[PDB]
């Protein structure tokens with residue numbers, strides 16, 4: 397996250413780290429056995445790490461659980477990043493508690509101007525790399541459709557929205573992929589892509605989760 401702040405340990409209790417011997421993507425716990433993340437985070441050999449703050453130290457409250465299956469949306473397009481959403485089933489259920497908790501799915505889409513919280517262990521630098529130990533947070537508004545499409549002509553589908561700051565300096569970045577955009581208690585977005593990180597006039601682009609709520613529900617009900 398570029399331009400954000402240290403969240404505070406376990407203050408974002410639905411935030412997950414996907415790990416294969418190192419953190420590679422975030423995700424969101426939506427019930428005790430299922431995580432939503434981005435399709436471009438798909439890999440084999442995923443351990444889901446719950447209740448994390450410092451990802452390099454065992455501090456207490458962590459739960460490490462292997463993925464038993466990862467379900468990439470059948471219409472995921474890796475060239476356009478359209479339908480950039482994946483569901484991960486845990487090998488066993490997480491213990492829910494104050495520090496490990498589900499986030500609610502939306503019942504409607506959010507409006508432009510809605511303020512949201514984005515979080516992750518991704519790169520904190522626009523130019524170089526610096527990966528944090530602890531979880532970073534960024535408050536960001538959802539941008540209007542027309543501003544989003546002006547920023548990225550021809551590249552924004554109805555399953556994408558922009559959020560962040562056109563002046564630059566505040567954005568998600570590499571390694572935040574798959575993580576939550578939460579607006580008034582509901583998971584509205586998944587960190588998907590952007591040009592660079594925190595560049596002027598190039599906001600972050602996020603999978604629009606309200607378009608996927610019945611697919612998520614029907615998929616979980618059959619698996």
Ligand SMILES: Cc1ccc(S(=O)(=O)N[C@@H](Cc2cccc(C(=N)N)c2)C(=O)N2CCCCC2)cc1
Pocket residue numbers: 436475477567568569570571572573587588589590591592593594599600601
């Ligand atoms: C299709 C695509 C678009 C943009 C890039 S990127 O190197 O400019 N920017 C990266 C880094 C990134 C990741 C997540 C969010 C942002 C952001 N600027 N909000 C940026 C990207 O979009 N990624 C998502 C796709 C997989 C590689 C990582 C690379 C590939």
Ligand SMILES: [Ca+2]
Pocket residue numbers: 448449450451452453454455458
């Ligand atoms: Ca830890």
